[PDB]
Amino acid sequence: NEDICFIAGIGDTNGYGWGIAKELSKRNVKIIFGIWPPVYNIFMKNYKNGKFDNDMIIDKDKKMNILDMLPFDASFDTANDIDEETKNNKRYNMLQNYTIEDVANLIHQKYGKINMLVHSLANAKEVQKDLLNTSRKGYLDALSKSSYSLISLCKYFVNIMKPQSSIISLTYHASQKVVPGYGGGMSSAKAALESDTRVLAYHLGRNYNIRINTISAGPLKSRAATAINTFIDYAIEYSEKYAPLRQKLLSTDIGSVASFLLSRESRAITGQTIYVDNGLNIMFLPD
Amino acid sequence: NEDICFIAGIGDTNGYGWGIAKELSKRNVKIIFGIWPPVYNIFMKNYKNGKFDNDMIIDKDKKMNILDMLPFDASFDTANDIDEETKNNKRYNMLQNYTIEDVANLIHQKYGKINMLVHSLANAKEVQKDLLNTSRKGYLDALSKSSYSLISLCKYFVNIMKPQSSIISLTYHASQKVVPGYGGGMSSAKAALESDTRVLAYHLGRNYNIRINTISAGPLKSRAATAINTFIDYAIEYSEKYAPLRQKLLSTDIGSVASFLLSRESRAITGQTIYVDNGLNIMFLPD
Amino acid sequence: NEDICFIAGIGDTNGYGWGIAKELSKRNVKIIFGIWPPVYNIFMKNYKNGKFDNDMIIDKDKKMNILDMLPFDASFDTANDIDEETKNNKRYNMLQNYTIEDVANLIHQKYGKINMLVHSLANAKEVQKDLLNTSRKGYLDALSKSSYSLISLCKYFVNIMKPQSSIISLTYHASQKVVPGYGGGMSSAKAALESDTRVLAYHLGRNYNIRINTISAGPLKSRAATAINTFIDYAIEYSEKYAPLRQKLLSTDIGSVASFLLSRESRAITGQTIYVDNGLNIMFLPD
Amino acid sequence: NEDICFIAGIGDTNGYGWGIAKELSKRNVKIIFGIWPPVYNIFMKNYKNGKFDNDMIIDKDKKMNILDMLPFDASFDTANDIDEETKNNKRYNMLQNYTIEDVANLIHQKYGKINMLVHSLANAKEVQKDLLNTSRKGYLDALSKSSYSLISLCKYFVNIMKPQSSIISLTYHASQKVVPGYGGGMSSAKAALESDTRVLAYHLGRNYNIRINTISAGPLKSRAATAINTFIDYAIEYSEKYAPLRQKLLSTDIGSVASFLLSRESRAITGQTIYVDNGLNIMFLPD
C-alpha cells in the first residue's frame, strides 16, 4: 500500500513501458505516465475515445490503475533550458511543467513522495546511420536524450523518493556486442547507460539507500523499433529461432521482471544489468 | 498450489539453503531437503528435538511446510558408484538410496513430478590451500562435488520434472575476480559452474523448455564458510563497509531472489549469473 | 620502412602519448604530433629551448624521430564547426588547419598516406564533480571531446590510411567498475569509447581491412591526472600495493604494448580492450 | 641471447604449438618440445625422415632451432602417479621420466633454468558428447588433463624458471558463450583455465614476479579439432564469413601474439585472456 510509480516513456500500448505498467498494476501499484509532448494529445484522444480499453484489461476484468498522465520531455532539465522555439511550438505551446524538475515538483505536490521510477525512453536523430557516419550533433543528441536523461531523472527525483526506493531503465545488448543496424550512437548511449547505472548505484546507495538497475531486453516490435527501418523483424526472427528458449518474448515478460526489481524482494540487488531475452545473449554460434 | 522443490545441500539453518526454503514457503511451495549422509542423523535429531522450531516460523500463523527430508550424496550418481569404503562406513551403512539417481526415483515414487530444483552445495578437501599448492586429487574433488554434481542432478531430475520447470545453483564472484583465501580449486569449480549453467541453459531450454540460472551471493557466515582460512569475517566486514548498499546481507535476501527465479514470473530469464551481494561486485577502488 | 604514426593528444612529456612515441621511435616509426592549441606555443617554446632533449633520448644516444608537430583540436570536425569566438581567441587566432578534417588533409598532402593512428586524449569540464551532480552540458562536453573525437578521427583518417592500418585509443577501468573520483561523465565517456571501439572494428574491418583496439591503462601521474584534484596519488599507491605485479607502471610500459598493437604482429586482434595495468583489474578484495 | 621456452603439447606441425615455436624462433628463442608419449615415436620418426623440414623453414637462411624433444604426459605429476596399466603399456614401457616433475628436473639438469613456458594441450575422452550426457569420469578427465595440468606445470616449473619469466596457455570462447559441439566438459575446462589464470597471476606475480596470461584463439583446422563433432569446418566457415576481419587465421597469427606475451615487452600484462580470433568474439547478430 502506498506504492506509486512514475513511468517516463509511454506513447502507446505497444512498447515495454505499457508492459511494465500492466504487471505493476497486478501488484496494486499506482501508475503515473510521463508522455512526450509530440504524442501527448494523440495519446489522450485515443485514451478518451476508449481505444485502449482492451489493452487496459488485467487479471479477471481487473482494470489498470492509472493515477495520472503528464506531459514530459527528458531533453529539458529545468524551465530555463526550454528554448524559445520549442516553447512556442504548436504541440508544446499549450502544455506546462513538462521539464524534469517541474514534473518532479508537480508529482510531489499532488501525490507526495514516490518509491518507484522507470526510465523507458530513448531517441536518436540519426539512428538510421551507422556509427562511422553519425555526426557529432547526432551522437550527442543520442547521449543527451537516451543516457543523460537517466542521470537527470535521478538528480531531481531522489528528492521526492522514500529511502529503499528502486529505479530501473532499459538497455540492449548492442552495447556489449556488435549489432549492425543499431546506429546513430544508440549503442554508445546504451553502453554509457549501463556504466552510469553502476556509478549511480554507488552514489544513490550510499547517500539515499536507493537502488538502481537496468534491464537488457530482447526484441519487441514497438513503435520506435520500426524507426530503425526491417531490422526489428530480423532481430525477432533470429531470437525466436536461436534463443535457448524458443517462445515469443512479450512486453509483460519484461514487465514482471521490472516488477520484481522495483519491489522490496530485490533488496540486495543494485547496479546490475539483468538480461530478459530468453537467453539469446549467452549464444555464440547459431545452429 | 502444487509446486514442489527439492533443495540439495542443507545441514542446518544457517546457510542459504534454509533461507531459500523459508522464502519458497511463503509462496506455499512444498519443500524436500537433500541432506548429506554424514550429518543426516544429527540433523534429524535436532529437528525432532525442536531445535529448529523458531527457524521454521514464517509470517503470522504460518509454519515452513517440509514435505520430506532425505539422505543425499552428490558424490554418487548411481548405486553402482558406491564403493566399499562408503558402503562399509558407519554413517552410510544405516542409510540407503542416497545416490543422485536413487533420490530422483524415490521422490518421483513418493510424490510424483516436481517443478523446482535447487543446487546449494559445495565441497573441497583442500580449500585451505591456495590454488598453486592444491593437489590434482584435491582439485578434482572440488570440481566433482561442486560442479559436476549440478550436471548429474539435471541429467537425472529432468525425467521427474514438469515442462517449464526451473533450476538454480549458487556461485561466488571469486570465479571472475581474485579472492586470495578461496582455495582448493573452489574458484575453479565456481568458474566451471557458471559456464556450465550457460551450456545447460541451451540444452534444457531447447529440449525441455526448462530454465536454469545461478545466483552469485555475497558473504554469509554459514557453517562451511567458517572452514575457509575468519576469512568469512573479513569478507563480511569488507562487504558491509564498501558495498553500495550498507546493510546486512541475509540468507532470505538470496531466498527471495531464488523464489523469483524459480517462479513463472522469470519466464524469460535463463543461463544467467545474477548477483545478490548488495552491489559489491561493481566496485573497483574502495572509498 | 614507410611507417608513419599520428599521435593526437600530446602537451608534454609526462603523459602516455609521449611514452607511446618513444617506443614507436625504437621501431623506427616516423612520428607526427597533434597538439591542442591552448598549449601549442608553450610546447614549441620548451621544445625549441631544448627542454625536452633529455626526454627525447632513446636507446644508446638514439634520438626520437619527430616528423612534424601540428596544432590540433578534436572538438572541431571541419573548419565550418569553428565558432567565431574560438577562431578569434588569442591562442587560436594565429593558427590554421587545426580541425580534424584539415589535419588529415594536411598530413596527406605533406607526407602521403599513413598506417598508424593514436587517440591519446580526453577532457571533461566538470571532471571534479561526481556523476550525479554533472550538468547536461558538462556530460555532453565529456562525450564530445573524449569519445566522439575517436569516431570523427576515424571517419576522416581512413581516407588517408593504407589497408591493414591500425588504430588505438586509451581507456580506463572506471568504465566497467566504480571508481569514485572519476567524475564529470568521464566514466560514461570511457564506456562509450570501449563500446564504439567494437562497432568501429566491425565497420573498419569489413570495409577497409583496418584494425582498432583500445588500451585500458593503469594510473600514471600525467598533467591531466592532476586535474582530478589527490585522486591520482591514491590510485598509484593502491596499484603498487595491491596489483599482482608490484612494480612502478611506466608510460613506456603502455608504449611497448601500443607498439605491438599498431604493428602487423597483432594482425588478428581487433575490437579489443587490452589491459596494461600490472594486473590490478583482476583483483576483487585487497590484502 | 639466452631465452629457452618449453612448449608442452605438440604432436605435429598443424597445431598452435608449432605456430608458436616458429614465431619464437624468429626471435632466436631456444625451443624444447613436450610430446605426448603415445605419439612420441611417430613424431620422432617423421622428424628423422625429414617430413617436417619444410615446416621448419623461417625467413631467408634461417631454420627453427629445436633444442630438444621429450616425452611428456600432463596426466602424471610425479613418478609416484604412474599406474601399472601405463607402466606396462607398450608405448610407455620404452620411455622414462615423462611425468611433469621429471621433465622439469630433466630440463634443468640438461640446460639450466628457462624463462618461457607454453601450455598448449587439451584432452577430453567424451568431447563428442554434449555436456548433459557427459559422465563424471569423462568430465573430470577433461578438467584433469586440460585445466589442472596448467597448475601442476606452474608448481613444478617455477623452481627452474628465472624471475620475470612468462607463461601462456590457449583457451576458447566456448567458456564464455555457448558453442553446441564443444562437449565432454571442454567448455567447463576452458572456463576453469581462464579463471585459474587469474588466480595464478596473483600468486606467481606476488611471490616470483612471474607473469601468466591465456590466449583465446579462433578456429584452426588442427589434428585434435577434427575430433570434435566437421564441427571445425563449420567454425572456420563461420569465422571467415562473419568476423570483422575477413582473412584466414594462421597458427603463426597466434604465434606472434604468444611471442609478444612471452617477451619483456608485455611486462605490465598479467592474468589476462587475450583474444586472437580476427575479432569474431565481438559480434552478436551475424550480418
Ligand SMILES: NC(=O)c1ccc[n+]([C@@H]2O[C@H](COP(=O)([O-])OP(=O)(O)OC[C@H]3O[C@@H](n4cnc5c(N)ncnc54)[C@H](O)[C@@H]3O)[C@@H](O)[C@H]2O)c1
Ligand atoms: N523494443 C525493443 O525491442 C527494446 C529492446 C531493448 C531495450 N528497449 C528499450 O526500452 C525503451 C523503450 O523502448 P520501446 O521499444 O518500448 O519504445 P516506445 O515503445 O518507442 O518507447 C519509447 C518512448 O520514449 C518516448 N520518448 C522519446 N523521446 C523522448 C523525450 N525526449 N522525452 C520523453 N519521452 C521520449 C517516446 O515517445 C516513447 O513513448 C528504450 O530505452 C529502448 O531502447 C526496447
Ligand SMILES: NC(=O)c1ccc[n+]([C@@H]2O[C@H](COP(=O)([O-])OP(=O)(O)OC[C@H]3O[C@@H](n4cnc5c(N)ncnc54)[C@H](O)[C@@H]3O)[C@@H](O)[C@H]2O)c1
Ligand atoms: N556462505 C557464503 O557466503 C556463500 C557465498 C557464495 C555462494 N554460496 C554457495 O551456497 C552453497 C551453500 O553455501 P552455504 O554457505 O550455505 O553452506 P552450508 O551452509 O555449508 O551449505 C552447503 C551444504 O553442502 C552440503 N554438502 C557437502 N558435501 C556434500 C555432498 N557430497 N553431497 C550432498 N551435500 C553435500 C553440506 O552438508 C551443507 O549442508 C555453496 O554452493 C556455496 O558455494 C555461499
Ligand SMILES: NC(=O)c1ccc[n+]([C@@H]2O[C@H](COP(=O)([O-])OP(=O)(O)OC[C@H]3O[C@@H](n4cnc5c(N)ncnc54)[C@H](O)[C@@H]3O)[C@@H](O)[C@H]2O)c1
Ligand atoms: N594518466 C593516466 O593515469 C591514464 C589512465 C587510463 C587512461 N589514460 C588515458 O590516456 C589519454 C591521455 O592521458 P594522459 O594522462 O597521458 O594525459 P595528458 O598526458 O593529459 O594527455 C591528454 C592530452 O589531451 C590533450 N587534449 C585535451 N583536450 C583536447 C582537445 N579538445 N583536442 C586535442 N587534444 C586535447 C591535452 O592537451 C593533452 O596533451 C586519455 O584518453 C586518458 O583518459 C591515462
Ligand SMILES: NC(=O)c1ccc[n+]([C@@H]2O[C@H](COP(=O)([O-])OP(=O)(O)OC[C@H]3O[C@@H](n4cnc5c(N)ncnc54)[C@H](O)[C@@H]3O)[C@@H](O)[C@H]2O)c1
Ligand atoms: N584448434 C583450435 O582451433 C583451437 C581453438 C582455441 C584454442 N586452442 C587450444 O590450443 C591447444 C592445442 O590445440 P590444437 O588445435 O593445436 O591441438 P593439437 O594441435 O591437437 O594440440 C594439442 C596437443 O595436446 C597433446 N596432448 C593430449 N593429451 C596430452 C597429455 N595427457 N599430455 C601431454 N600432451 C597431450 C596432443 O598430443 C597434441 O599435440 C588446446 O589447449 C586447444 O584447446 C585451439
Ligand SMILES: Oc1cc(Cl)ccc1Oc1ccc(Cl)cc1Cl
Ligand atoms: O533499444 C532498442 C533496441 C531494439 Cl532491438 C529495438 C528498439 C529499441 O529502442 C529504440 C531504438 C532507437 C531509437 Cl531512436 C529509440 C528507441 Cl526507443
Ligand SMILES: Oc1cc(Cl)ccc1Oc1ccc(Cl)cc1Cl
Ligand atoms: O562459496 C563460498 C563463498 C564464501 Cl565467501 C563462503 C563460503 C562458500 O561456500 C563453500 C566454500 C568451501 C567449501 Cl569446501 C564448501 C562451501 Cl559450501
Ligand SMILES: Oc1cc(Cl)ccc1Oc1ccc(Cl)cc1Cl
Ligand atoms: O582517464 C584517466 C584515468 C586516470 Cl586514473 C588519470 C587520468 C586520466 O585522464 C583524464 C581524466 C580527466 C580529464 Cl578531464 C582528462 C584526462 Cl586526459
Ligand SMILES: Oc1cc(Cl)ccc1Oc1ccc(Cl)cc1Cl
Ligand atoms: O579448444 C579447441 C577449440 C576448437 Cl574450436 C577446436 C579444437 C580445440 O582443441 C581441442 C578440443 C577437444 C580435445 Cl579432446 C582436445 C583439443 Cl586440443
